[PDB]
């Protein structure tokens, strides 16, 4: 998605988290904007030494490397839950014998 997400000079609209207190569980979503305390002195919302903002903006330029250029990724999660099947394929059904 370099063509759409890249503009002259680079796009910074998309962020990613750099630090977190612990390992994320599968399908776990944190969106808090708290200051990250990498040190011993609590930040209490105060940045500085060992108090960084966990997010960092991507640099997506048209001249960036292919490994640095933006990519759009979709993750489809499949489940067979306690219910009749709801999402089915284009298969054509037949009469019963």
């Amino acid at each position: 998605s370099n063509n759409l997400d890249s503009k002259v000079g680079g796009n910074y609209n998309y962020l990613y988290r750099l630090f977190r207190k612990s390992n994320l569980k599968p399908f776990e979503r944190d969106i808090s904007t708290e200051i990250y305390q990498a040190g011993s002195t609590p930040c209490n919302g105060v940045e500085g030494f060992n108090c960084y903002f966990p997010l960092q903006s991507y640099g997506f330029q048209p001249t960036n490397g292919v490994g640095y250029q933006p990519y759009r990724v979709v993750v489809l999660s499949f489940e067979l839950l306690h219910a009749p099947a709801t999402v089915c394929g284009p298969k054509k059904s037949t009469n019963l014998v």
Partner: nanobody, 127 residues
Framework: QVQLVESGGGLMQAGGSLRLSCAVS????????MGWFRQAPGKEREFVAA????????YYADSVKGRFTISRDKAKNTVYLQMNSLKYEDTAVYYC????????????????????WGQGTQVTVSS
Amino acid sequence: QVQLVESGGGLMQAGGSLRLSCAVSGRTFSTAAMGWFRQAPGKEREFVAAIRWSGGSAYYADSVKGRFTISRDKAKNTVYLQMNSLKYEDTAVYYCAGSKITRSLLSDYATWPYDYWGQGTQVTVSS
């Protein structure tokens, strides 16, 4: 929805120390950038200091380089301007502003418009 509440400054001697604040409420400036301006009588509003919010890189005008310093806090949602080594010419009405556009060059934030402006606070430097 978005309010930029300024504080600090005032009248003091030359070379004094001040640190202007501009509290940001209802919005974050992560991908865009924030900037400071001042407006002296009979003059146009002039650029002083602009900073990228996420990255922390600073950009200063030649009238303020080495004398004024810009800093920000993200959780408190406040930007500061450390006003050291004052001069007589620095007397003006200072305007905090935040942009809605993500500009690739932090230098483009010195001229490109800001869609949020503060109320304005006077700063006077005396003999």
